[PDB]
Swiss-Prot record:
The lineage of its organism: Eukaryota, Metazoa, Chordata, Craniata, Vertebrata. Potent pro-inflammatory cytokine. Initially discovered as the major endogenous pyrogen, induces prostaglandin synthesis, neutrophil influx and activation, T-cell activation and cytokine production, B-cell activation and antibody production, and fibroblast proliferation and collagen production. Promotes Th17 differentiation of T-cells. Synergizes with IL12/interleukin-12 to induce IFNG synthesis from T-helper 1 (Th1) cells. Plays a role in angiogenesis by inducing VEGF production synergistically with TNF and IL6. Expressed in activated monocytes/macrophages (at protein level). Keywords: Cytokine, Cytoplasm, Inflammatory response, Lysosome, Mitogen, Pyrogen, Secreted. It is found in: Cytoplasm, Cytosol; Secreted; Lysosome; Secreted, Extracellular exosome. Induction: By LPS. Transcription and translation induced by M.tuberculosis and a number of different M.tuberculosis components in macrophages; EsxA is the most potent activator tested (at protein level). In pancreatic islets, release is increased by high glucose treatment. In pancreatic islets and macrophages, release is also increased by endocannabinoid anandamide/AEA. Changing residue 23 to N: Requires 2 nucleotide substitutions. Belongs to the IL-1 family. Monomer. In its precursor form, weakly interacts with full-length MEFV; the mature cytokine does not interact at all. Interacts with integrins ITGAV:ITGBV and ITGA5:ITGB1; integrin-binding is required for IL1B signaling. Interacts with cargo receptor TMED10; the interaction is direct and is required for the secretion of IL1B mature form. Interacts with HSP90AB1; the interaction facilitates cargo translocation into the ERGIC. Interacts with HSP90B1; the interaction facilitates cargo translocation into the ERGIC. The keyword GTP-binding does not apply. This is Interleukin-1 beta. The gene is IL1B. (Microbial infection) Cleavage by S.pyogenes cysteine protease SpeB promotes its activation independently of CASP1. SpeB-mediated maturation of IL1B plays a dual role depending on infection site: while IL1B inflammatory response prevents bacterial growth during invasive skin infections, it promotes streptococcal infection of the nasopharynx by disrupting colonization resistance mediated by the microbiota. GO terms for cellular component: cytosol; extracellular region; extracellular space; lysosome; secretory granule. Changing residue 115 to C: No effect on binding to IL1R or on IL1B activity. Markedly reduced activity. Markedly reduced activity.
Amino acid sequence: VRSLNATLRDSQQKSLVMSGPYELKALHLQGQDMEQQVVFSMSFVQGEESNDKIPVALGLKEKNLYLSCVLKDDKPTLQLESVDPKNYPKKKMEKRFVFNKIEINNKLEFESAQFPNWYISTSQAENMPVFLGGTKGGQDITDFTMQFVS
């Protein structure tokens, strides 16, 4: 499987960082303070592709930790999941780990492959967790830019 290191920033220029072992938060970050920003390993996995939709998995670079989801109390929920550091990543990743990377005018959206029309979302306010939101439209942020890193 092919991968790619990158950071994500919401359309509001918020950066993502590790809250506890298993949460991500979004905050406005500038300066050498930028160092505390999470670098993903974005893997191109197997799934349904279009010129516009590309299935990926999103792990933390050098951690055996992956964004997935779970129904938690009858709702789709974003979580960080530990995996066997020897089996991952794979081309044929389990569905819970798969997002459709959607290009939409220089911006990206990350839709759950598992829950159609649920997106990786951040909040308008500082220091709130990154979550899975089912609504696009003036409120929560569902769009990101991506920066390559080495």
